[PDB]
Ligand binder design. Structure first.
Ligand SMILES: O=C(O)c1cccc(O)c1
Length: 308
């Protein structure tokens, strides 16, 4: 079978490379019986559209933001608790935990997809066209976000003016003043060159940004038993590989952003004042897995079970 695999990420992005690597290995491991055609850069639609077509089976596979999935399955919102992870290495350990993996079990019924495992992109950061010396400076700023509720809620609690916008429009929106600031990770700040019209780069690491490898449940049900196992295991391997890329490259891409002639500062949880508390109140009755995920995160840190 010729499977199609969609992503919203541009071609240089880690996810896109991982999807191509997965496709190559599936072709080889299947002895040519199967192939994967990868469609990056939103070629097949936006992420919401792609999830709709995974649900029907019109689209076979995706490497998808857990952000979009959370629009369908609000418990996925638990991963976005601010400062749940202290850094990318902590985040990877959380996403590999039994607690996280258990949350995948609901996807076939609730979203019509099989989630094989979690990967990630980098941590979230903030880039602004003006000076930012405290959280008050974010008040009223038109601030680009990924279109999902956890991040909307964080910025609403801070009093910014969050504005959902897909990746391709962001550089132009900054250049032309349609937004004053953006929420984005260091990989894409580098790749999309969004620092060019920014004043200040804030390395806040305020939220993680998981990825999930998805197979349409309708398509999965049509696979042989051997292929269900082989394809899901192979996809899980490639999705998991992204965690190791970010564990290595996050600080490298971050250091690159000290070389673009802008004001560069690192901030921690205290910078955000009461927004973190407000976020917890909003999400307490929306994401029941949150207390267990917090316990898992805390135990991983206490037992030093990742590189730190
Ligand atoms: O900021 C985003 O919307 C985004 C979406 C996908 C991957 C990624 O690194 C970032």
């Amino acid at each position: 079978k010729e499977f199609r695999l969609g992503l919203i990420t541009p071609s240089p992005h880690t996810w896109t490379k991982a999807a191509e690597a997965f496709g190559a290995e599936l072709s080889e491991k299947s002895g040519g019986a199967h192939s994967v055609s990868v469609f990056p850069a939103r070629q097949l639609g936006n992420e919401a559209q792609m999830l709709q077509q995974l649900q029907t089976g019109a689209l076979d596979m995706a490497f998808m933001t857990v952000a979009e999935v959370s629009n369908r399955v609000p418990n996925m919102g638990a991963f976005y608790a601010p400062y749940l992870a202290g850094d990318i290495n902590h985040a990877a350990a959380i996403l590999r935990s039994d607690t996280a993996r258990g949350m995948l079990a609901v996807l076939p019924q609730e979203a019509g997809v099989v989630g094989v495992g979690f990967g990630s992109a980098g941590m979230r950061q903030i880039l602004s066209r003006g000076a930012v010396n405290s959280a008050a400076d974010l008040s009223g700023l038109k601030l680009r976000i990924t279109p999902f509720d956890p991040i909307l809620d964080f910025y609403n609690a801070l009093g910014a003016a969050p504005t959902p916008m897909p990746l391709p429009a962001v550089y132009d929106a900054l250049a032309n003043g349609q937004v004053d600031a953006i929420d984005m990770d260091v990989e894409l700040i580098n790749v999309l060159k969004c620092h060019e019209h920014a004043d200040t780069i804030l390395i806040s690491n305020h939220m993680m940004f998981p990825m999930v490898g998805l197979i349409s449940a309708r398509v999965y049900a049509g696979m042989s038993d051997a292929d269900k196992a082989m394809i899901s295991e192979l996809m899980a391997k490639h999705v998991d590989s992204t965690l190791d890329v970010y564990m290595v490259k996050e600080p490298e891409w971050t250091d690159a952003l000290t070389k673009v002639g802008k004001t560069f500062k690192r901030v921690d949880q205290s910078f955000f004042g009461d927004a973190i508390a407000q976020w917890e109140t909003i999400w307490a009755d929306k994401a029941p897995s949150l207390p267990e995920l917090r316990k898992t995160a805390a135990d991983l840190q206490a037992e030093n079970l990742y590189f730190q």
